[PDB]
Amino acid sequence: QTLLVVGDSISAALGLDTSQGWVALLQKRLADEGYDYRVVNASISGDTSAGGLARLPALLAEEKPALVVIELGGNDGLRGMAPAQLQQNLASMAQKARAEGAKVLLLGIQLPPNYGPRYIEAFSRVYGAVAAQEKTALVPFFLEGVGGVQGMMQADGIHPALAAQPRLLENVWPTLKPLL
């Protein structure tokens, strides 16, 4: 009955009190609404689709999760890495999680507008592709109402501020709920 979150800086709550981070809020909402889940946050700043893929098997073996939330690839895009390798790595992660017995939920991220639609979309479309291929659930716009917004982003315009954490949780819950 474990919900494993495998993310980067966004889910690790970079730049804020982790107890106020979206995953922390997830655990509190599960508790409040009388759901019986252990939330294991395995998010690490700096992580990439390749890094998450490399470290997932150990996590699956150790926790044997019923649900795996994957929030990776934001770094692949921010670094200008290849969109195709993102699709491969995420697909393989979703395959391996499903192989362990877990339902998979992908969190998709859109880079800031200044990257331009073609770049933004090149990575953004990958999430939908992986969900299609591996039959996963998907939140295509995890940063809806957060990205690009003033107050919601920290100054570097990538890492959500404290005020955004509720909204991050709002963005996942609806798509997560039916999986519980």
Numbering used by the authors: 1 to 180
Sentences reproduced from the published study:
Furthermore, GDSL-hydrolases are characterised by a three-layered α/β/α-fold with a conserved core structure consisting of five β-strands and at least four α-helices. The GDSL enzymes have catalytic residues, namely Ser, Gly, Asn and His, located in consensus sequences designated as blocks I, II, III, and V, respectively.
The crystal structure of TesA has been determined at 1.9 Å resolution. There are two molecules per asymmetric unit which are related by a two-fold noncrystallographic symmetry (NCS) (the root-mean-square difference (rmsd) between NCS related molecules A and B is 0.38 Å or Q=0.984; note: for identical structures Q=1). The monomer atomic model comprises residues 1-180 of the protein (light blue), no electron density was observed for the C-terminal His-tag comprised of residues 181-186. The compact single domain structure is comprised of a central five-stranded β-sheet surrounded by five α-helices and three 310 helices. The structure of TesA confirmed these residues as active site residues located on the top of the solvent exposed substrate binding cleft. Both the positioning and the orientation of the catalytic triad residues at structurally conserved topological sites classify TesA as a typical GDSL hydrolase. Interestingly, a comparative B-factor analysis of TesA and TAP revealed significantly lower values for TesA. The more compact structure and the lower B-factor values clearly indicate pronounced conformational rigidity of TesA. The structural alignment shows the presence of both waters in TesA, in identical spatial positions and with the protein environment comprised primarily of highly conserved residues. Superposition of TesA and TAP revealed a structural diversity in the thioester binding site, where TesA shows significantly lower thioesterase activity.
